[PDB]
Amino acid sequence: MYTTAQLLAANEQKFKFDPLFLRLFFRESYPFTTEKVYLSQIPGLVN
């Protein structure tokens, strides 16, 4: 009512967060139009 408070700077409390994976191991990003995706591994052991 008559306190005439003054505001100073406010701390932010930033969260600790860093991928290290998406930026390092997952360079390629692919979106889907289909409802499923297959993956193929070709076993090559030529005799």
């Binding site: 100073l8 700077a9 406010a10 701390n11 409390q13």
Partner: protein, 48 residues
Amino acid sequence: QREGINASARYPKNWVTTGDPAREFTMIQSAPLMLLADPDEFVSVQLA
């Protein structure tokens, strides 16, 4: 308030008292509220 220095860090002041004793003083006033924005930034540990 007379000198309009309501906001400051230090305020010297000298004056002499009336009457038979020629008594005069020296005086400095301050209101320090030294603070920090982040209380959790510093990590204090008592070693043992």
